């Protein structure tokens, strides 16, 4: 059903790529390590690695992470008392100019979901967007999250070009999951969440890097449920994105989906930019 095409490492204007970012919902740092997720990171050797759903505070990080080759500048965020839940990481070869946590809004800054790293020519945000939950019990909260998050990003983008990556917990369009018709009332494919996402692209503004390059390409997913061995049948969802400011599009080389990389129920995604 899907074969990600070869890595295009030069820009439309012929500039070689200078930055490789990789994002990955790891479904628990210790499970991911146990499943050889680190081995794959060493093969990708990104300039910056963003991790979501670490399920782990900084006080309890596995030693294998301290010894991650290349990525020495590491920033970690998690719920401060609740183990086994949410949590994000941002790991970089180069030291950022500034690193901050959350979105400036007390209600939305308790669950370790957002890290912002500022560099010379752009700002990188990684996020683990709140799931709407079984029975949509968190859908109202998610809509409030979506609005606060959008305003925050609009604010960052007014100063510097922006890259947002992570598990944004939404499949934008019907092409972004295998079973759109069965999922219109479920977390990840409700009109409210799909609308929030659409308005995010238009308000900041941001472009969906993968869909911009591959507008008609179906069956490209980043998440498959362990349930019923969905991955072996490619019954999945694209929940993981690189969204970028329109000003960065001339710098865009490729946006990749590493379908075969094991370690989680999500696969990694990888961006090439010529900055
Ligand atoms: Mg998970």
Residue numbers in the entry: 44 to 318
How does the study describe this entry?
Here, we report the crystal structure of human APE1 solved at 1.92 Å resolution with a single Mg2+ ion bound in the active site. A construct of human APE1 that lacks the 38 N-terminal residues, APE1ΔN38, was crystallized under neutral pH conditions by sitting-drop vapor diffusion (at 22°C). The crystals belonged to the monoclinic space group C2, with three molecules per asymmetric unit. While some residues within the structured catalytic domain are absent in previously reported structures of DNA-free APE1, electron density is observed for all residues from Leu44 to the C-terminus (Leu318) in the structure reported here. The same octahedral metal-coordination geometry and ligands are observed in all three active sites of the asymmetric unit. The observation that DNA-free APE1 binds a single Mg2+ ion at the A site (Asp70 and Glu96) and that a second Mg2+ ion does not bind at the B site is consistent with the results of two previous NMR studies. One of the two residues that directly coordinate the Mg2+ ion, Glu96, is strictly conserved in the DNase I superfamily, while the other, Asp70, seems to be restricted to mammalian APE1. The carboxylate of Asp308 binds two of the four inner-sphere water molecules of Mg2+. The coordination mechanism for Mg2+ observed in the new structure differs substantially from that observed for Sm3+ and Pb2+ in previous structures of DNA-free APE1. Our structure (1.9 Å resolution) and previously determined structures of free APE1 (except for the two-Pb2+ structure) contain a water molecule at the ‘B’ site of the DNA-free enzyme and a second Mg2+ is not observed in the recently determined structure of the EP complex (2.4 Å resolution). Together, these observations argue against the idea that Mg2+ binds to both the A and B sites or that a single Mg2+ moves from the A site in the free enzyme to the B site in the ES complex to activate the water nucleophile and then back to the A site in the EP complex.
